[PDB]
Curated annotation (Swiss-Prot), chain A:
It is found in: Cytoplasm, Cytoskeleton, Microtubule organizing center, Centrosome; Cytoplasm, Cytoskeleton, Spindle. It comes from the Eukaryota. Component of the HAUS augmin-like complex. The complex interacts with the gamma-tubulin ring complex and this interaction is required for spindle assembly. The chain holds residues 499 to 548 of 597 of the full protein. Contributes to mitotic spindle assembly, maintenance of centrosome integrity and completion of cytokinesis as part of the HAUS augmin-like complex. Belongs to the HAUS3 family. Signal peptide: none annotated. This is HAUS augmin-like complex subunit 3.
Amino acid sequence: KLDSHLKELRDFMYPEGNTLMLTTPELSGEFHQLGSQLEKLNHITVEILG
Amino acid sequence: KEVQATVMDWWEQPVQLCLPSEERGGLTLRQWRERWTVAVTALQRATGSRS
């Protein structure tokens, strides 16, 4: 039982087997994408004001 | 991109070239602009004021 509990919790926390994951990978990917798109929008804005 | 287009329209004012055959004082707008450009250029040459 102890071995099973340990294996289940570990599988959940280490989805890619090597790294403890605190954020949902799907969410982490979206944050990065949103940050990149905002940086582009800020360039276009600066360029037009200039 | 749309805002950039608006900025462009404000700077070029394209509506001034829409009636070419219209004469006022015996000359067209273009002719008047040309007269203006020659005069502005002559003034700028006299007034040493190198633009």
